Design an enzyme around this catalytic site. Sequence first.
Site, PDB file in Angstrom:
ATOM      1  CG  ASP A 138      -8.723  70.646 -39.864  1.00  0.00           C
ATOM      2  OD1 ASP A 138      -8.984  71.247 -38.822  1.00  0.00           O
ATOM      3  OD2 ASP A 138      -8.171  69.707 -40.211  1.00  0.00           O
ATOM      4  NE  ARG A 142      -6.769  67.837 -36.296  1.00  0.00           N
ATOM      5  CZ  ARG A 142      -5.848  67.310 -37.322  1.00  0.00           C
ATOM      6  NH1 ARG A 142      -5.049  66.202 -37.322  1.00  0.00           N
ATOM      7  NH2 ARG A 142      -5.927  68.115 -38.649  1.00  0.00           N
ATOM      8  CG  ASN A 143     -11.303  67.908 -36.601  1.00  0.00           C
ATOM      9  OD1 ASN A 143     -10.507  68.548 -37.247  1.00  0.00           O
ATOM     10  ND2 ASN A 143     -11.462  68.221 -35.513  1.00  0.00           N
ATOM     11  CG  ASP A 156     -17.050  73.248 -39.925  1.00  0.00           C
ATOM     12  OD1 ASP A 156     -15.815  73.116 -39.908  1.00  0.00           O
ATOM     13  OD2 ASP A 156     -17.712  74.004 -40.033  1.00  0.00           O
TER      14      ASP A 156
HETATM   15  C1  633 Z   1      -9.430  64.435 -30.268  1.00  0.00           C
HETATM   16  C2  633 Z   1      -9.737  65.726 -30.605  1.00  0.00           C
HETATM   17  C3  633 Z   1     -10.419  66.081 -29.308  1.00  0.00           C
HETATM   18  O1  633 Z   1     -10.035  65.912 -28.176  1.00  0.00           O
HETATM   19  N1  633 Z   1     -11.574  66.852 -29.434  1.00  0.00           N
HETATM   20  C4  633 Z   1     -12.308  67.511 -28.628  1.00  0.00           C
HETATM   21  C5  633 Z   1     -12.225  68.012 -27.256  1.00  0.00           C
HETATM   22  C6  633 Z   1     -12.999  68.630 -26.699  1.00  0.00           C
HETATM   23  C7  633 Z   1     -14.356  69.230 -27.371  1.00  0.00           C
HETATM   24  C8  633 Z   1     -14.604  68.837 -28.176  1.00  0.00           C
HETATM   25  O2  633 Z   1     -15.871  69.324 -29.162  1.00  0.00           O
HETATM   26  C9  633 Z   1     -16.911  68.570 -28.849  1.00  0.00           C
HETATM   27  N2  633 Z   1     -17.111  67.698 -28.016  1.00  0.00           N
HETATM   28  C10 633 Z   1     -18.076  66.732 -27.684  1.00  0.00           C
HETATM   29  N3  633 Z   1     -18.181  65.965 -26.577  1.00  0.00           N
HETATM   30  C11 633 Z   1     -17.167  65.461 -25.770  1.00  0.00           C
HETATM   31  C12 633 Z   1     -15.556  66.102 -25.778  1.00  0.00           C
HETATM   32  C13 633 Z   1     -14.559  65.521 -24.800  1.00  0.00           C
HETATM   33  C14 633 Z   1     -14.933  64.476 -23.916  1.00  0.00           C
HETATM   34  N4  633 Z   1     -14.359  63.958 -22.905  1.00  0.00           N
HETATM   35  C15 633 Z   1     -13.969  62.423 -23.276  1.00  0.00           C
HETATM   36  C16 633 Z   1     -13.221  61.645 -22.272  1.00  0.00           C
HETATM   37  N5  633 Z   1     -11.791  62.653 -21.968  1.00  0.00           N
HETATM   38  C17 633 Z   1     -10.930  61.660 -21.127  1.00  0.00           C
HETATM   39  C18 633 Z   1     -11.897  63.902 -21.600  1.00  0.00           C
HETATM   40  C19 633 Z   1     -12.543  64.662 -22.744  1.00  0.00           C
HETATM   41  C20 633 Z   1     -16.401  63.911 -23.819  1.00  0.00           C
HETATM   42  C21 633 Z   1     -17.166  64.585 -24.560  1.00  0.00           C
HETATM   43  N6  633 Z   1     -19.337  67.078 -28.186  1.00  0.00           N
HETATM   44  C22 633 Z   1     -19.154  67.854 -29.251  1.00  0.00           C
HETATM   45  N7  633 Z   1     -20.048  68.470 -30.028  1.00  0.00           N
HETATM   46  C23 633 Z   1     -19.868  69.440 -30.956  1.00  0.00           C
HETATM   47  C24 633 Z   1     -18.396  69.678 -30.651  1.00  0.00           C
HETATM   48  C25 633 Z   1     -18.080  68.777 -29.468  1.00  0.00           C
HETATM   49  C26 633 Z   1     -13.870  68.093 -29.158  1.00  0.00           C
END
Ligand code: 633
Length: 302
Positions: A138, A142-143, A156
Amino acid sequence: NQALLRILKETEFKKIKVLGSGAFGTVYKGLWIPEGEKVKIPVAIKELREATSPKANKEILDEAYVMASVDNPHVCRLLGICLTSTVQLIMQLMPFGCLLDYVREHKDNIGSQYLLNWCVQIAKGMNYLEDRRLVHRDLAARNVLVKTPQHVKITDFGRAKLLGAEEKEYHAEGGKVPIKWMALESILHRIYTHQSDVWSYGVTVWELMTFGSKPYDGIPASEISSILEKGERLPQPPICTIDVYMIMRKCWMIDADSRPKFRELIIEFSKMARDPQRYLVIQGDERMHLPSPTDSNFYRAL
Ligand SMILES: *CCC(=O)Nc1cccc(Oc2nc(Nc3ccc(N4CCN(C)CC4)cc3)nc3[nH]ccc23)c1
């Protein structure tokens, strides 16, 4: 030192807020305060969906030890696990979210050096996964997640599969699949290999070079195998020199053996990242700026 799976008790971490959710379950922003250690570590917590047939704890721990051993700068690491009524995976928090959204939000300030560096990093992460006999299945913008604007990590959400010593393919079962990122043999026969991951890498690079455009926008997923068999492919991004586009096109050859290996992609993109403006043409490239720890030193962001 060496990457090992930590077993966490519910007393040692806290879910602060939801970041997102999907078929896999829900991901939370969280805090890990390791027992006795007097430190507080921001983390991402994935609480997996309840399965019809939950694996035994022994089965889950065996899988988790293998995934915890995945230790590379460009793959998001599993730091710990907590098993209760649910499975909670404690991951490195990537503070800036997914690379797809980052490049859409910051496109006006993303230069050739960043784009090509990201291509190198993703290729390095994928080559490491291949060395570990893991087929990702995948790969897409986005990933890929963003630790800093300068450093990204592949993640993953459950589709990755470990191959045995003598297995060169994974044979998948039915379900929803990311058609527009997939190799023809995966679409038509549910066959996945390191070389079908290479196909997806090509599409991911195309996403980056178009600053987050949707591949085959407006075209029904059901028609994709037909257009691929006719020989049609994603078009040359306007900023890409022919050299860059030709690498991308090689990733989408029908013969999986004709596609580049990730080791070769590291070498080619590393060469290009060393002279970025020769290989990508971006208006105002030399002026573009993303937040860097050196901003104060150079009096940027006044
Ligand atoms: C483009 C794909 C997508 O949106 N991916 C995604 C969203 C939510 C959680 C996720 O998994 C993991 N996230 C993170 N850190 C993270 C996610 C989102 C955000 N914010 C950024 C600013 N926007 C406006 C709102 C969302 C900030 C930080 N860290 C991770 N480690 C393992 C898995 C995830 C993926």
